[PDB]
Amino acid sequence: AEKVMEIKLIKGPKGLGFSIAGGVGNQHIPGDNSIYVTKIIEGGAAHKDGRLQIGDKILAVNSVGLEDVMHEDAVAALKNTYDVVYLKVAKPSNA
């Protein structure tokens, strides 16, 4: 049983307010074909609203699964969203 948390991102003037990494095709994570965060905008939207930092893994956004495709398609998953978009992330706890 892993922990599950939601991350809200506001579509402010900067957009999502962060960056994503794709494991499929354009593998950014050393050993993972999912999505991971790579950059956060200083309290832009994802950082301030989402409170997410480089190292978190996205397992879904709102109702879209951007955790089984390349970094590019994942971007489409985020951009396709609206004002506030919530992401679902789970932290791996070692016992």
Side-chain angles (χ1 to χ4, degrees):
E2 306 168 90
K3 314 123 102 51
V4 192
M5 45 181 71
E6 291 168 59
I7 300 295
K8 264 155 275 172
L9 326 190
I10 317 304
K11 218 48 48 73
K14 227 95 199 248
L16 275 299
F18 80 121
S19 278
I20 61 117
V24 189
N26 273 319
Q27 222 155 26
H28 166 101
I29 325 108
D32 253 317
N33 311 85
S34 314
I35 271 286
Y36 283 67
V37 185
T38 176
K39 208 151 86 194
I40 338 299
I41 305 297
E42 306 209 33
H47 204 178
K48 210 175 195 303
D49 211 291
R51 312 146 307 171
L52 63 93
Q53 52 172 54
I54 305 181
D56 281 9
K57 43 149 280 184
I58 308 293
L59 84 104
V61 182
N62 275 6
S63 213
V64 59
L66 36 149
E67 30 138 28
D68 51 54
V69 68
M70 318 119 125
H71 166 74
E72 255 282 90
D73 216 43
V75 189
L78 315 151
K79 284 169 64 263
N80 271 350
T81 74
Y82 319 73
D83 278 33
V84 182
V85 67
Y86 30 99
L87 330 187
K88 239 141 113 205
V89 172
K91 311 300 221 122
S93 269
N94 211 40

